Design a protein around this ligand. Structure first.
Ligand SMILES: [Zn+2]
Lengths: 200, 50, 52, 86, 121, 83, 120
RNA sequence: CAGAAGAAUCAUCGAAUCUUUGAACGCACAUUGCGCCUUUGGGUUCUACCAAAGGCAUGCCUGUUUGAGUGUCAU
RNA sequence: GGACAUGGGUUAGUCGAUCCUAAGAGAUAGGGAAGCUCCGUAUGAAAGGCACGAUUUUUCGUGCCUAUCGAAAGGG
RNA sequence: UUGGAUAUGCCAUAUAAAGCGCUUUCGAAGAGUCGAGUUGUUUGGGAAUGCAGCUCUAAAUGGGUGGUAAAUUUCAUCUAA
RNA sequence: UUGACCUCAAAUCAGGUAGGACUACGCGCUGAACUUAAGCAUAUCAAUAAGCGCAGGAAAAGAAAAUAACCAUGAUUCCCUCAGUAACGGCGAGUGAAGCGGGAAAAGCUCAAAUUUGAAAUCUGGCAACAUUUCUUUUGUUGUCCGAGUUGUAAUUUCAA
């Protein structure tokens, strides 16, 4: 198949071919809207390995997110507190721009379920992402045993609750000692609970 | 004032109907614990504030 | 309209920019006489339709 | 009530021109003539053509808006669209 | 008092005359109440009101059952005639499509199902 | 620092009746209700105003539909007429 | 054949706008006329001023629905009492109910009509 | 109290009604304000006026239809 | 007795509101924002019309050119 | 009203499918992602514990991890995006 | 010139879906100060309150890029223990886990990367037939057209292989 060639070619994105394609695609994506529907995936094998099937009920949206760190929305850059909280500029959003791209697209298409997403381009102002979406009301989705799970009501706004791949990455879900903060509220609540047994 | 909205006259009409004494046969009922209207209003004393 | 400007400025952009050899090789296409004869061969071996 | 504006009732309401009937029915001139052949629909001139043209004087063929309203619910028009698809 | 079972075994037009006659009777009774009426008339006011309600119920049920008969075995039917359990229940996967499985899983369940076993002492 | 003789110029409403919550909290010039946030789609609500929430929360009104739904749940959401 | 543009503007072309042809009606049963004459006319008024208007002005005074207008009151009176009014005046009372003064024609006697209604 | 006579201010509850609103959806709204579409009906009154019923929000998805492009070609 | 009780009482084609626009509010196009929401009001929008024709390959051709709300003292 | 069995009735093209066993064999395995630096913010994580921003950007017995940073050489373990 | 295709639009087009409320418990984001340190700036309070977004009857987590250094264990969750311990801290005030072990409960799996290539074997919808029902309210089946799909839908495979 050609998907193997597409994958190993995408690894080489500092080649002259990819640099030229990055230039022209970034130009035309800026000329479109910030969120615009993609007729087909620009990386069909990247979408394919992330869960996109080429049948009715699957949707692709392209979204550009402004890069950089976070700017404190305090007026005039004033914090009114101890000096350990006076930072205004070099602060960082704890969710990735890929999470931000997913959640803005999820609000744009409230009738769809955000399956997953992938990076497609970037420049000095934007990182461009394509979001794979699934229509839960479509019968082609409702009758497919490999994708029914997203029709269930417990998967409404996976990206908003942090259940997408990048969402689990952003909140530190992982196995082993390196995390150990894991679910943060769950782990923090587990110890800070003072278990007072009946007999003590 | 004389210039009223229809909404105001409705609220004023209901306020007038609620600003009445209680029927006398209510006071004779079995298990009755209501004697006088506790929600009565006078036009100088308490304002409707609409 | 914006989509028409997108079409034409993309055409202009591909002309202006330095296209890499691996992409510019698709700008050299088959000739008309060779094209009609190869398509004549292909129409003899079209796959069967769903009805057939 | 407030002042009613002229050309809103009477001849200017019950009469319709050929071009506005085309736009009302969303039909071409040939297709509109076709249903007018099939059904009984012919021009009907107002007694006051100037008033029924909302003050204009240009020569105009007039149909009853009732006739054109009736043609809105004609199944043959949908059959014309079906043949165009075919 | 008007009884619902003989109300149901009549025609819609006949019930239309009964409904209009009852409305006129209620209007006459209300005029009697404002001109000075006895407790018998004032009791007939509530009786007439309930009889009107019973008739209107019978018309509506006849209309709805007729709509149900007309839309029987139709893919799309009026919303008010559809089910109304909850919004979530209407949005859930049906038992048919909850139980849909791949041929890979069908083969696994066909050849290696959960067996009924027991252990000797 | 002027009391009497200054309350006599007060004859201009700043709030009127709200169409959503029915309270005299609809700022005319803002075109916003100070109570419920109308015309916003969400309802004005704040966790510091716990008493404010319980003054208007679910159950303070009729709950006519929620009562019907609860009765229908107890018997299993069945439809039709009993035989 | 290249199309000549004489406007320097591109204006969105006009496309066919099909009318709605639903696969099902959203309502199974159409509602009955929500405001019919029995709901339009609530009661007549028999107060002393109401009697005075009846016996001199040839005018009947009715408690009517809030949603009833002058046209609907005239049609309701015509259909309920077979007398055509020549004039109708309406006011919302301070108690929130609407009251209609119905001036009958010289052809009709308001005293007689009040007698048939029964409240006289 | 009056009052009548499968009763009942009874219980249950699977059929219905559910005004004006409200996420609130034709546009509004300190204005029972201002519109448009389709059908039907009314009467001393009929090219007029009126009434009734059913409709007209936004985003997105599948499909249909109608399109636009010095976008890619074939011819 | 403006108090308490019981009833009664406000009738519009022409008087106002409604209509118009003012300062100003405020959608839409878009762009921001983790978001609540912010900015923006003909703007980087495909933002709608009107007329002619023996009926045109009975698959339409040929022409021509801005919301809304906001005044019971403004306009009418 | 439901449940799992049971009695048979009918429909079912195994022309199929499947487990197991040996291969002198072959075995595709997810990239602006891993990793590195840096700046914030976090952690009990201390020569950065996780997350995020920016810069640089892999690989093919390769890549992680073995709680003191570095180069080097072994060993376990596991197989991310 | 007609056509094919791509891209982008329109419709009160056919059929759907989203908001709001609730929020005790779930997942996130954002985010203080009073307080303590007998002052106070790192720290503490606290990864808390307030704010914002999104769920469910539970949520989240989950079948190891996990531990261990053993004669080795074996998804996740919770309890007890580890343990006020290793460690972090103007090493001050303070803060502070994990492996093991015992228990509660246990359940495993699905794709991407493969040429079906002697046969797109796949699926939405329109129509018409039947059938079915917690249900005239529900859920399907078969046929036939139109489409979707080769810029890849089924079958086969998931490293334990
Ligand atoms: Zn309010």
């Amino acid at each position: 198949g050609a998907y193997k060639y597409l994958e190993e070619l995408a690894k080489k994105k500092q080649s002259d071919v990819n640099l030229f394609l990055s230039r022209v695609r970034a130009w035309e994506y800026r000329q479109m809207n910030v969120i615009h529907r993609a007729s087909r995936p620009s990386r069909p094998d990247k979408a394919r390995r992330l869960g996109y099937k080429a049948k009715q009920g699957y949707v692709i949206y392209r979204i550009r997110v402004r890069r950089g760190g976070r700017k404190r929305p305090v007026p005039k850059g004033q914090t009114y507190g101890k000096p350990v909280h006076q930072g205004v500029n070099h602060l960082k959003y704890q969710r990735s721009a890929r999470c931000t791209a997913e959640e803005r697209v999820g609000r744009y298409c409230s009738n769809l379920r955000v399956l997953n997403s992938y990076w497609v381009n970037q420049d000095a102002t934007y990182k461009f992402f394509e979001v794979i979406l699934v229509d839960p009301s479509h019968k082609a989705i409702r009758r497919d045993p490999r994708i029914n799970w997203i029709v269930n009501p417990v998967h409404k706004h996976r990206e908003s609750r942090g259940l997408t791949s990048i969402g689990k990455k952003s909140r530190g879900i992982g196995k082993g000692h390196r995390f150990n903060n894991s679910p943060q509220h769950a782990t923090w609540l587990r110890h800070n609970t003072l278990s007072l047994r009946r007999y003590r | 004032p004389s210039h009223k909205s229809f909404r105001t006259k409705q609220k004023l009409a209901k306020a007038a109907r609620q600003n009445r004494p209680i029927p006398q046969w209510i006071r004779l009922r079995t298990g009755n614990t209501v004697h006088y209207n506790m929600k009565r209003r006078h036009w100088r004393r308490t304002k409707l504030n609409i | 309209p914006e989509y028409i400007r997108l079409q034409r400025r993309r055409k202009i952009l591909n002309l202006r920019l330095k296209v890499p050899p691996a992409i510019a090789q698709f700008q050299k296409t088959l000739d008309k006489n060779t094209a009609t004869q190869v398509f004549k061969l292909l129409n003899k071996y079209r796959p069967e339709t769903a009805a057939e | 009530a407030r002042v009613k504006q002229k050309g809103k009732a009477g001849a200017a309401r019950i009469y319709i021109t050929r071009n506005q009937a085309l736009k009302k029915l969303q039909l071409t001139l040939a297709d509109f003539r076709r249903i007018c052949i099939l059904k009984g629909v012919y021009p009907r001139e107002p007694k006051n053509k100037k008033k029924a043209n909302k003050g204009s004087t240009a020569p105009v063929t007039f149909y009853y808006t009732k006739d054109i309203q009736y043609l809105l619910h004609e199944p043959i028009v949908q059959k014309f669209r079906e043949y165009k698809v075919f | 008092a008007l009884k619902t079972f003989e109300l149901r075994k009549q025609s819609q037009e006949n019930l239309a005359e009964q409904l209009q006659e009852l409305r006129q009777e209620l209007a006459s009774l209300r005029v009697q109440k404002i001109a000075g009426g006895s407790g018998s008339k004032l009791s007939k006011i509530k009786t007439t009101r309930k009889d009107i309600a019973r008739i209107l119920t019978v018309i509506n049920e006849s209309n709805r059952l007729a709509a149900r008969e007309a839309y029987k075995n139709k893919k799309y039917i009026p919303l008010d005639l559809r089910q109304k359990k909850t919004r979530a229940i209407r949005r859930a996967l049906t038992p048919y499509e909850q139980s849909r499985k791949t041929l890979k899983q069908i083969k696994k369940e066909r050849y290696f199902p959960l067996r009924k076993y027991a252990l000797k002492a | 620092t002027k009391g009497t003789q200054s309350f006599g110029m007060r004859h201009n409403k700043s709030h009127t009746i709200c169409r959503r919550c029915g309270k005299r909290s609809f700022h005319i010039q803002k075109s916003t209700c100070a109570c419920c946030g109308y015309p916003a789609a969400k309802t004005r609500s704040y966790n510091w105003g716990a008493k404010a929430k319980r003054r208007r929360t679910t159950g303070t009104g009729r709950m006519s539909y929620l009562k019907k739904v609860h009765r229908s749940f107890k018997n299993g959401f069945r439809s039709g007429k009993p035989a | 054949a290249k199309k000549v543009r004489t406007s320097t503007t591109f204006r969105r072309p006009k496309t066919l706008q099909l009318s709605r042809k639903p696969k099902y009606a959203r309502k199974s049963v159409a509602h009955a006329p929500r405001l019919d004459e029995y709901k339009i006319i609530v009661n007549p008024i028999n107060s002393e001023s109401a009697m005075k208007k009846i016996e001199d002005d040839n005018t009947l005074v009715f408690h009517v629905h809030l949603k009833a207008n002058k046209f609907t009151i005239k049609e309701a009176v015509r259909k309920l009492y077979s007398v055509e009014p020549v004039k109708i005046n309406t006011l919302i009372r301070p108690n929130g109910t609407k009251k209609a003064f119905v001036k009958l024609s010289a052809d009709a006697d308001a005293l007689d009509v009040a007698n048939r209604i029964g409240f006289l």
